[PDB]
Write a protein that binds this ligand. Sequence first.
Ligand SMILES: *[C@@H]1O[C@H](CO)[C@@H](O[C@@H]2O[C@H](CO)[C@@H](O)[C@H](O)[C@H]2NC(C)=O)[C@H](O)[C@H]1NC(C)=O
Ligand SMILES: *[C@@H]1O[C@H](CO)[C@@H](O[C@@H]2O[C@H](CO)[C@@H](O)[C@H](O)[C@H]2NC(C)=O)[C@H](O)[C@H]1NC(C)=O
Lengths: 226, 282, 211
Amino acid sequence: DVKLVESGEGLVKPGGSLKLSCAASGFTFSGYDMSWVRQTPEKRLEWVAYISSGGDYIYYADTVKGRFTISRDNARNTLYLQMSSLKSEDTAMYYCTRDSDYYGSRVWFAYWGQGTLVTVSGASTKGPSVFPLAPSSKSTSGGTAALGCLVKDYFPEPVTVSWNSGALTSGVHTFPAVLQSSGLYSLSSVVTVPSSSLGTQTYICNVNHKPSNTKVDKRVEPKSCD
Amino acid sequence: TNATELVQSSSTGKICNNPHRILDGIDCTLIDALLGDPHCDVFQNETWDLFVERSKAFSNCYPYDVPDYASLRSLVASSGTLEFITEGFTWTGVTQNGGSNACKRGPGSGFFSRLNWLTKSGSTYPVLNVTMPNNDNFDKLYIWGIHHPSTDQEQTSLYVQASGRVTVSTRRSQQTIIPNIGSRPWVRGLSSRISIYWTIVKPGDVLVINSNGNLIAPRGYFKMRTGKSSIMRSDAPIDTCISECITPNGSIPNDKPFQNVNKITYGACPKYVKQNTLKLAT
Amino acid sequence: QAVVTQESALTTSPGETVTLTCRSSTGAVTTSNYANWVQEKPDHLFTGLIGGTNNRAPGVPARFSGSLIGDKAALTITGAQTEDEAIYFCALWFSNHWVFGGGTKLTVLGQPKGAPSVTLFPPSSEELQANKATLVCLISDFYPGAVTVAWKADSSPVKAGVETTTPSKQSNNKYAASSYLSLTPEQWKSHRSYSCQVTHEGSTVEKTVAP
Ligand SMILES: *[C@@H]1O[C@H](CO)[C@@H](O[C@@H]2O[C@H](CO)[C@@H](O)[C@H](O)[C@H]2NC(C)=O)[C@H](O)[C@H]1NC(C)=O
Ligand SMILES: *[C@@H]1O[C@H](CO)[C@@H](O[C@@H]2O[C@H](CO)[C@@H](O)[C@H](O)[C@H]2NC(C)=O)[C@H](O)[C@H]1NC(C)=O
């Protein structure tokens, strides 16, 4: 049961820079060999860097040479990639890969990380303004009610939303974002809950848009004004 | 009435080191311990009744591959010992003890403990007219290799010949392997590789090795015996206890005539069966 | 050079036999290229399937097979399943380089046709008191990818303030999109008759939800 978990997604200006970490779990090393691979917004896959136990033998994406450095922390079991003098062409979601198994397998890139987004930006960032999506007054089919929050006018992706600190993990569905005409994204997430429990349990959007330091909880409730 | 169930559908979950000497090859294969990977040269001259391979086993010395691997690994598992006996070969003019940082042994460069990577000495690599006789009363297993370089320049830089060759002969055996030059993808760095072949010698017979390059020399031999030893792939923990047969799911009681947990067993065990339950009336 | 190519997309049926391919720009594909195949299921769930020319990864069932048919690399799924609906990239080893293809989108049919569940929310009143009001049409979990969305205001169609995007959710591998119309607090004032209607070809009829 191998797992690779990434971190460090954030927005950067041109010529700017970012460092990324991927926390490796479930296996003896930080990685036997490990490598960084990014997929452009055009969903093309380019390999970036590679490591040994201590970085032996060519590991260079010639288009990133002199700009990136890949490191591994053998003690804390961590993999790092700090890229500097960033270009438009580096905007991607970088994936944490540990190359595949022994003589029998020797498949490259079997185990992957879920990826973290790197955006080489320009001219400003913006923080979202969350608005609550209140429940209906009339009960159609009785049963349950549906409510959510609108993650409007944020840039760039992603915003991570949960509900009541993971206290609500099922019936919750956070939908993808829309790139609006303004170059901004806007997203929403909705959960469906029984009709009785609308004033006895209170529902809060744990949305955060981490590319900037944004984290705004917001409660959803009927507003009692026809 | 009452009833006898006869299918052992339950295991202890742990491997019990009695009455069988159980050797846990913690971080390596049997081959790593056989080749002499530096992090498992702890298993030097070890003996066993059941070797246990764990799933997280791994190799850190020079990237290699073994043609007929399963035959080799279980050939050593059946004699049940890694008893290596250095034989002190003479390698005239070819610079023994080559190592690199993929196999970092101690402070820096190292290599397989039981393998001798030869290079050029000065700026030459002569053709080796070696010989070594097995005149004793037991069969010798010789583990030797070949280097597949990553470029034509690598072949020249270490084994000046444009094309190398290794020939490990006996009066009954002959094996001539040629290194195909190619830059493989990186495994623990290097794009070069090593392929492992073996040569058993029976009493009186002689082992000779002719080579114009790319030879990965042996240092000695493993004394081979015939016994009840074997090997097992398992992640079941080892405890000090008693059970006479062992499964990959941990030890079994030998109480019942049949067993359901696994087809793979060791020792006097019940016979594997597909059944999920069988009650005989008493 | 070193540009690796493969078909843009494929489509097939369960039980059938598929064969995805991967080609070189440097000429003939050999074992010395060490064709590696990785499978991305949606929301960035990658899995390496075949490496080392034929070598199958541990958890991969034997139904997947890699080979060379001619001067090409290839990936064959003998006994395709609905489990195999994914995007399959390919990577070949050119000694200096290490490159990927564009990736093939595999579309397996047999997926149960999903009817879309349609829910709409009005602009929040805190959202109201600002310069901008946005209300939400949210369509949930339909399998057929194609879908058409129509906004109309007091029985009259509208556009040029709308934005929508395509829902390739892995959730139940059904598609579940969102719609936003963005009306100014004084442009949105043709009151009591705004809503969202979408048409799917899981449509027996197209569904409307009105506040
Ligand atoms: C275990 O392995 C070591 C090293 O290969 C063997 O050590 C040799 O033992 C002989 C006599 O037993 C000495 O003359 C040599 O100098 C030792 N070293 C080497 C490098 O050959 C040892 O014999 C093996 N068997 C044991 C310890 O039972
Ligand atoms: C090579 O070394 C051997 C070791 O003694 C020398 O002896 C001959 O070895 C060859 C095998 O290559 C045998 O066929 C001969 O029968 C050996 N000679 C005798 C008298 O038995 C040999 O002289 C060395 N050189 C060569 C060129 O073989």
